[PDB]
Design a protein around this ligand. Structure first.
Ligand code: K
Ligand code: K
Ligand code: K
Ligand code: K
Ligand code: K
Ligand code: K
Ligand code: K
Ligand code: K
Ligand code: K
Ligand code: K
Ligand code: K
Ligand code: K
Ligand code: K
Ligand code: K
Ligand code: K
Ligand code: K
Ligand code: K
Ligand code: K
Ligand code: K
Ligand code: K
Ligand code: K
Ligand code: K
Ligand code: K
Ligand code: K
Ligand code: K
Ligand code: K
Ligand code: K
Ligand code: K
Ligand code: K
Ligand code: K
Ligand code: K
Ligand code: K
Ligand code: K
Ligand code: K
Ligand code: K
Ligand code: K
Ligand code: K
Ligand code: K
Ligand code: K
Ligand code: K
Ligand code: K
Ligand code: K
Ligand code: K
Ligand code: K
Ligand code: K
Ligand code: K
Ligand code: K
Ligand code: K
Ligand code: K
Ligand code: K
Ligand code: K
Ligand code: K
Ligand code: K
Ligand code: K
Ligand code: K
Ligand code: K
Ligand code: K
Ligand code: K
Ligand code: K
Ligand code: K
Ligand code: K
Ligand code: K
Ligand code: K
Ligand code: K
Ligand code: K
Ligand code: K
Ligand code: K
Ligand code: K
Ligand code: K
Ligand code: K
Ligand code: K
Ligand code: K
Ligand code: K
Ligand code: K
Ligand code: K
Ligand code: K
Ligand code: K
Ligand code: K
Ligand code: K
Ligand code: MG
Ligand code: MG
Ligand code: MG
Ligand code: MG
Ligand code: MG
Ligand code: MG
Ligand code: MG
Ligand code: MG
Ligand code: MG
Lengths: 37, 90, 166, 142
RNA sequence: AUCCGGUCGAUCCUGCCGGAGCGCGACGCUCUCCCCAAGGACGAAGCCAUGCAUGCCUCAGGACGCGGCGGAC
RNA sequence: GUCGCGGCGCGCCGAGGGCCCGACGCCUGGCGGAGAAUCAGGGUUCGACUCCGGAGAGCGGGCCUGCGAGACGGCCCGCACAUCCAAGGACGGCAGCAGGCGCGGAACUUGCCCAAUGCGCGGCGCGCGGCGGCGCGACGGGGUGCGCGCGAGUCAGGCGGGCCCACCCCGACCCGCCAGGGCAAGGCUGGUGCCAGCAGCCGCGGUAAUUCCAGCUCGGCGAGCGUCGCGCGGCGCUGCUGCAGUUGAAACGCCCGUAGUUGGCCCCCCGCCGCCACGAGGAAACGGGAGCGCUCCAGGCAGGUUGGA
């Protein structure tokens, strides 16, 4: 055990009903597609 | 306030009193106290209790014990209501 | 014991069995769009409140048209379903209860009623106006968006006399 | 009919079911009582103990790695277990006398994945949750 | 009154392993407002400092005491 | 002898009594029911704790007083443990309410009050019980905006309350937690190079990684999300409804045969079973269910001649 952590050591939107409204209008082709963003 | 009505009046000549339910109506404003509307419901023989205000306001319901004598009130009234009216204070 | 040990309580919604099904996942958000729904629980509640009135009818329909249980409970069920406006007068058959959908339940919410009479421009503006104690039912100020309005009490939905919009 | 019928055979139908119920491995494991005796945790969700050593364990055939684990002595029955430490760099919070809260891997007492002979895992070290120690929300004294 | 991933070069099966739901506790992280509400039971019926959990009414100013009912609920 | 019947005890006489329709013995991390968790129908599992019944008060025994106790906030003795002491003696029982130690993964204040519901004596008593405190075990409602007005807080007066507070009324100021190859909704840059690590199961990583560690973006549930263990479901993989037995696991080498299970057809209009239906009688709470706007709701039994069917 001398290697543990090797890679580790070497490396407001709207809320509630308004967030669901945002998703409703945003959706109504993939959500995280490359072409859109 | 301006509107005071009473129902469910029961005469009780065993406890020397009369029991009532009182409805108080004050649309828009408060009714300021029980000591205020005590005039509409002598005065010193009236025992007012159990008043609740509904949601939004405008309505209040309470209960009245109206005695006829004065010994009767010091005899048949709970010992903490006589202190809420200042009548004894011990 | 204490007296509070004798008080009842109950859960009022049922979660679905497969969470990650796409067609009902977007059908479930069209519903959150047409009505100002906070979260999925308010859909679940609705379905739960349907699943009971559907269980009653199917129990009575298995019975016979002249039994007293049908004559008593089906009449009670129909008389309750007509006052809330979940079911309408022209359908006074117990078999007309089975073809009911959730949308019929959602249409009698206060948030929906005030939109229909155009007191509010949309359903989101309606929810905001509900929270602001700006609307009264029969002279009684009601604060609850989810309030269920009976057909008797739908003539009498207004802005509250005590208000900053009066 | 390969099963007895007849209006007065309830006793036989019950005896057959009582006898053949024990043939299922799930029922026998959960109802016999030998697994409860042999269980290091004694039928509990979790258990605390002290660390006696730090170790590295080879993986199984198609994988190649050195997994990090600790030998633990149980407080309540003095048994010997080995428990796995997940979450990169977490083996560095485990001194040789560190009270550890230990739970299971899932699978109700079966080894998972590629770690031979490991059925338990550390969830808390010296009073502090190990996951929050990795996520950098709390820290150990010194 | 519903299934899905894993045995092969590919295929149809038997068969288990794994996943997906509800409940009860324990652990972690996190938390604005209001109503209801469980809370040392879980092979320790192990051990207990301190205070409180049972009193109320025939014969003389009163206590005190005697007598009485209760302390088995 | 007992309140009383009885092998309950004693003397005498006889040899009975129970059993594969499972006796006897052993084991139980065994209190029983009303009930609870799960969910097509049939079922499986659990019955610590609210009501009803039983048993106990460190462990054995014994007893007095009383209508009623084999009483432990009564007494006596043995044992195992503690207490004060001038050393002669005296003395204890929280599985009551708080509180502490120990143990465990795991569980709150050494508060105020007899105002209510009831009980003893009649006026009091009561850690029954009531009211506050701690309380993300769990339940229910509403927010973090809408196209321009609110709530959370602040300060006053009411109402309420044994006294204070919370709720309600009037007045003036003002997310998070898990993920992103498949099961299963959701994809570009840097680092690392079978190492570190991930991964319930398939699998990923060998110096171009859709999976490790990070950044951006996106997905799900949401004041709540993830992990561990267990019950039920999934499961027609326990099968009565309803499995399988040529070759996948599975028909005794064969014949006889008791208990057990099963047994053709026929008389109708009696008796005795079973069976079907309807009654009587006994507990409520829970579970269903008629009626009622605690602002809705989880609730409750309310209420405006009434009602709790
Ligand atoms: K068969
Ligand atoms: K069969
Ligand atoms: K058979
Ligand atoms: K038969
Ligand atoms: K069988
Ligand atoms: K099923
Ligand atoms: K396969
Ligand atoms: K093959
Ligand atoms: K297969
Ligand atoms: K305990
Ligand atoms: K106990
Ligand atoms: K246990
Ligand atoms: K437990
Ligand atoms: K204990
Ligand atoms: K007595
Ligand atoms: K006594
Ligand atoms: K005898
Ligand atoms: K004898
Ligand atoms: K003999
Ligand atoms: K037996
Ligand atoms: K036990
Ligand atoms: K069933
Ligand atoms: K069954
Ligand atoms: K059933
Ligand atoms: K089933
Ligand atoms: K309890
Ligand atoms: K008990
Ligand atoms: K009990
Ligand atoms: K009880
Ligand atoms: K009882
Ligand atoms: K009892
Ligand atoms: K008892
Ligand atoms: K007892
Ligand atoms: K005992
Ligand atoms: K004792
Ligand atoms: K004892
Ligand atoms: K004893
Ligand atoms: K004893
Ligand atoms: K007795
Ligand atoms: K005795
Ligand atoms: K005794
Ligand atoms: K004590
Ligand atoms: K106990
Ligand atoms: K207390
Ligand atoms: K401890
Ligand atoms: K501890
Ligand atoms: K009292
Ligand atoms: K008495
Ligand atoms: K108390
Ligand atoms: K405001
Ligand atoms: K305010
Ligand atoms: K402001
Ligand atoms: K404001
Ligand atoms: K304002
Ligand atoms: K990760
Ligand atoms: K698993
Ligand atoms: K799987
Ligand atoms: K797989
Ligand atoms: K690279
Ligand atoms: K099954
Ligand atoms: K089943
Ligand atoms: K089934
Ligand atoms: K078969
Ligand atoms: K074999
Ligand atoms: K074989
Ligand atoms: K074979
Ligand atoms: K055979
Ligand atoms: K055989
Ligand atoms: K034979
Ligand atoms: K034969
Ligand atoms: K034969
Ligand atoms: K035979
Ligand atoms: K026979
Ligand atoms: K048989
Ligand atoms: K037979
Ligand atoms: K036969
Ligand atoms: K019958
Ligand atoms: K009763
Ligand atoms: K009447
Ligand atoms: Mg003999
Ligand atoms: Mg029981
Ligand atoms: Mg019980
Ligand atoms: Mg208890
Ligand atoms: Mg006692
Ligand atoms: Mg005793
Ligand atoms: Mg512990
Ligand atoms: Mg609310
Ligand atoms: Mg089954």
């Amino acid at each position: 055990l001398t290697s543990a952590g090797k890679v580790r050591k070497c490396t407001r939107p709207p809320r509630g009903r308004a967030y669901k409204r945002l998703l409703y209008n945003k959706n109504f082709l993939g959500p995280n597609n490359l072409l859109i963003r | 306030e301006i509107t005071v009505k009473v129902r469910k009046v029961l005469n009780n000549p065993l406890l020397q009193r009369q029991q009532c339910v009182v409805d108080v109506l004050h649309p828009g404003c408060t009714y300021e106290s029980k000591e205020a509307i005590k005039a509409k419901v002598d005065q010193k023989n009236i025992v007012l209790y159990g008043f609740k205000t509904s949601f939004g306001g405008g309505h209040t319901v309470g209960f009245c014990n109206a005695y006829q004598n004065m010994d009767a009130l010091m005899k048949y009234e709970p010992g903490f209501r006589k202190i809420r009216c200042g009548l004894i204070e011990a | 014991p204490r007296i509070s040990r004798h008080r009842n309580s109950s859960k009022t919604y049922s979660t679905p069995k497969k969470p990650f099904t796409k067609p009902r996942l977007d059908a479930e958000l069209k519903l959150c769009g047409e009505y100002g729904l906070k979260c999925k629980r308010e859909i679940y509640r609705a379905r739960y409140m349907l699943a009971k009135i559907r269980r009653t009818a199917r129990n009575l329909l298995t019975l016979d048209e002249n039994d007293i249980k049908r004559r008593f409970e089906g009449a009670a069920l129909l008389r309750r379903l007509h006052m809330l406006g979940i079911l309408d007068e022209e359908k006074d058959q117990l078999d007309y209860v089975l073809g009911l959908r959730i949308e019929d339940i959602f249409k009698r919410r206060l948030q929906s009623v005030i939109v229909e009479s155009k007191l509010a421009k949309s359903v989101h503006h309606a929810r905001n106006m509900i929270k602001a104690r700006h609307i009264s039912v029969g002279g009684q100020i009601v604060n609850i968006p989810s309030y269920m309005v009976r057909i008797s009490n739908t003539s009498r939905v207004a802005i509250a006399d005590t208000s900053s919009l009066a | 009919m390969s099963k007895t019928s007849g209006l007065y055979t309830a006793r036989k139908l019950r005896t057959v079911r009582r006898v053949n119920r024990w043939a299922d491995k799930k029922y026998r494991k959960a109802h016999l009582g030998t697994w409860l005796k042999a269980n290091p945790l004694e039928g509990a969700c979790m258990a605390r103990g002290i660390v006696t050593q730090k170790i590295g364990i080879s993986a199984k055939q198609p994988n190649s790695a050195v997994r990090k684990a600790v030998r633990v002595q149980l407080t309540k029955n003095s048994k010997k277990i080995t428990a796995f430490v997940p979450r990169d760099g977490s083996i560095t919070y485990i001194d040789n006398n560190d009270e550890v809260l230990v739970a299971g891997f899932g699978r109700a007492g079966r080894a998972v994945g590629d770690i031979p002979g490991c059925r338990f895992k550390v969830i808390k070290v010296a009073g502090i949750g190990l996951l929050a120690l990795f996520l950098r929300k709390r820290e150990k004294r010194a």
